Amino acid sequence: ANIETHGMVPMNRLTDDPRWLPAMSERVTRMVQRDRNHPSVIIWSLGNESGHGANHDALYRWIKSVDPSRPVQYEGGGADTTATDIICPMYARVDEDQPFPAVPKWSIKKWLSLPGETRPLILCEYAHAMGNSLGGFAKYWQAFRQYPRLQGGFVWDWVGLVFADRTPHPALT
Amino acid sequence: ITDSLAVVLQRRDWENPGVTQLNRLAAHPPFASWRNSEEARTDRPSQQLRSLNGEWRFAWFPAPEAVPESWLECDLPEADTVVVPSNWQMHGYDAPIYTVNPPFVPTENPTGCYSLTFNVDESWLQEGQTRIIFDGVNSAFHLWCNGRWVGYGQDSRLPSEFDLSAFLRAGENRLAVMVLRWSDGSYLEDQDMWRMSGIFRDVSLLHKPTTQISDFHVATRFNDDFSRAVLEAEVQMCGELRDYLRVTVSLWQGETQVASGTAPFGGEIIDERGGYADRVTLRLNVENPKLWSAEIPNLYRAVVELHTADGTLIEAEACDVGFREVRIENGLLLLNGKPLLIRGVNRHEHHPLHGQVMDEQTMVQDILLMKQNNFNAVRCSHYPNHPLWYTLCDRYGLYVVDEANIETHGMVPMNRLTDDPRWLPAMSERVTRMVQRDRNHPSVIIWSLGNESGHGANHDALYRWIKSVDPSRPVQYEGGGADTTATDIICPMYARVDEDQPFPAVPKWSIKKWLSLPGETRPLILCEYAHAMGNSLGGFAKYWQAFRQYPRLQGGFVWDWVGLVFADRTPHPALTEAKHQQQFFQFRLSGQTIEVTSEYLFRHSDNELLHWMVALDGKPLASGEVPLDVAPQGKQLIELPELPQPESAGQLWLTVRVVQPNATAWSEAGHISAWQQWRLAENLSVTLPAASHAIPHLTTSEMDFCIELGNKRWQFNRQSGFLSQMWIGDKKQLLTPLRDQFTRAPLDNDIGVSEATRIDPNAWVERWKAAGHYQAEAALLQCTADTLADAVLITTAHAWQHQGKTLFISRKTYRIDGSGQMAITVDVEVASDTPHPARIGLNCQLAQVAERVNWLGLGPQENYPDRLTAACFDRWDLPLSDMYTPYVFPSENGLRCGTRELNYGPHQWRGDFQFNISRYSQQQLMETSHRHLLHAEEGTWLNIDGFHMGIGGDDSWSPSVSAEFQLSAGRYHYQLVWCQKG
């Protein structure tokens, strides 16, 4: 869904405000009504980098009621809130923890085994490919193979892994 | 008659799994039968409990049928005298054994016939019940009293009690105990230790009144914040029920009573037919109770008095009560609301010189040593322990896992008996009688169903029995994959931190992966890990890094306390590594600020002092002491003063240590509990050496190169290509030429289970032998000598070939300058297809024997690439004897890593190397079976390695050296400087 408010100073200033719920509901509902018939679409996403507000929980439950055939994921508020069926951290590391206040980025191996955690983990963003990059990519895929509940991820910026003229980067190999 | 041996032994009760006892009394907590409340409160000795330990008569027989009938009446003429708490194998009768027909035992069953003549006062026989308690008898036994058969028993590790009232006569009496070595119970006690047999625990006589306390157990309930507690005690009596009988339970903290309760008999309504007339439950309210933990073992004294309504006491029983709550919440094992981190060790009952007989002094010595090494938990390794062990763990503070005596690892399906309902009665007795005995001890926090018996339906049934009877403790069981339905805790044996071991039907996942398997929510505590056999415990820091990071990884139990110490309780070098990794204070350095985090859950750091020191290459520069004021799990930030900034070359090292100024019950004043070291600042050396005016002189012959400088002189063998001799004055310095070494005397981890019969091709030592590393012969490729403007240059190249295959190539450079110094640069190529060598360095036999070894490097104790975290960089001076570790089976030992300078006699070696120095060569260590056969050689053997392979430790039967500690680079370089006192 076309919801992205990363510039807000609390970052949930609008997604926790009920006055913005009508605006955000239109962006979620009209997407589902348009694309619900496509077999390729297997997961709904509530947006990107908008904190976690009560509007996210309400819109998460709307999708589950209208279309129970697809899981709903959302990074925001720590990537493991009640508004996501999948733990989907951004740029979580394989072994090193990043305990930021109120939104820690645990290592993906440790994140799975936290007390009470049963959901699968798929990284919505990992392996930043800006410039000469993608070092340690083999570390992620060693972990993906070994751990059943580590079910892959999405490399950031296809185009990126290729130039604008679609010429490939060395990291694409 | 029917008391005769022929009748008694005819039914073969020791070959019947359905008969485990005959005429044995019910299990219960320990009883002393005090006739005075004050004596019970203060735990004074009771005159109603009499010990029969002492001198008994003993006779040995090859089989039970060989015992003559006359033994039942009179002591044999050839019977000798022994101290009854002993194993008869320790007296040399049949050979002790360290190592099938499931119900049957061999007909050649050695039999020990014990007999004792004792006196009984008439006061015991006129009134009351007199019983005899056998705390431990190995396998099975038959009991006679004055020639009359009494009963039969099994389950060596739990007390057997029999009523002797109808058998005792006023005056002199005689007891006859027929102990058999093997019974059907031996199939459930088929573990791996010295087998041994006899009456290995205490024998005592207890006199109880006609109306007596038959059983009692206590339960503690708490509110949300543990500010209010309820102590419920259920008391059961035996004998005649009278309406004037009363039971009083009083709780004492020291000498002040804090709670009390009195009630007549008659319990609450249980079901339709009513309630127990012989039971009463007393509820005692305690405000702000002092909680029990391993850190602070706060104990109360509960006194249970059976008395008349008027006020006359009949009998008194007492026990120590600790207030604590153990439960698993959200996949975490909590004690008093806090997540436990188990610093545990497995401990067998092994006396230093009396075999399996345990005494109080050895137990207190073991507990003190454990707590001084930051251990907080002990696993009762595969059987219930001596009763006094649990009392001592309550008082000093140690979490205890109590294990049922069930062990059937020798069965081919390994669950052949535990899945057989015909063996359920046998196994139930071993579980139920343990719980009935030890359920009142606060130190016991976890029940264990046994060890290495597969997983059968009997395990599930016995697991649910414990949960019903005692819901206050979790139940754990390894077996059937360590995560079955019969365990509340995933308790794998020797699971690795990162590497998975997917065995069929019982995989050993890595502990990190095991936690996150689909549907898995339980905590993980390793019942056995870090095998400490020989030179071992490599990679121990890997486990404790994982323990800290993952909340549901709550520690484990290191295998074999005694092991981590020798039989005489002398510590192994690996014990220091365990103490450092198990510290309760963690340290972080950021600039001039030291962050100290407390790992205690309950206590405040009120006996703690931080001493910091800054040294430059072992030379102290500044020091200071700061008191520690850290809340449980809190952080204290300690800002160091302006640290010294020397302009001399070298590395600055900051060392902190936690010192306890006051003595505790388990430690003496000045005890060091934690330490840490850092590198502060290094000034690289840029100064040139002094312009020596002299030049070493080179002479060339067809057999050798000779370099002469003053009184010193070097000789290089041109045929061998190695430095053969060095002379200071006219005194030779070497007995063996300085040559490259690529092998080490194999460790126990290097050997594995590779016997001479069942070879293990995957073992490290077998791969080295198959590759010819021990048989490779050095071949000289080139050897040249050139005179420089100020030095003499020697260049050599050797190839180590085995059966037409080059394993290693060594290119060495010798630079003898005019100052007398000798610089040695070594470049080594290792073939990629050969197994990685155990070491890359040099060795020689020095002619001189010296008393002290002085080196600037890591640790006073021996350390290895994967067991060096506990070691510290400083200047160490030790006698040569302390440079050798006396392992029972000789192997490579005594290595010191991270060494920059080594001094021995007049010789100094500088560089970046590891070394071991001793009087035994690596060749002798490989060929000598036991350390008592080791003999010192003529000189001193020195091994200087640029690189050394890590030691194993995850297990002892499979390769366990991690990839980052294997010598797999392929090409290696190191430099050494050899100088003298000039």
From Swiss-Prot, chain B:
Changing residue 957 to F/G/L/T: Decreases affinity for substrate. Changing residue 348 to D/F/L/N: Less stable to heat than wild-type. Causes significant destabilizations of the first transition state. Na(+) binds at residue 192. One of its GO terms (molecular function) is identical protein binding. Induction: By allolactose. Keywords: Glycosidase, Hydrolase, Magnesium, Manganese, Metal-binding, Sodium. Mg(2+) 1 binds at residues 407, 409, 452. Its EC number is 3.2.1.23. Its cofactor is Mg(2+); Mn(2+); Na(+). Homotetramer. This is Beta-galactosidase.
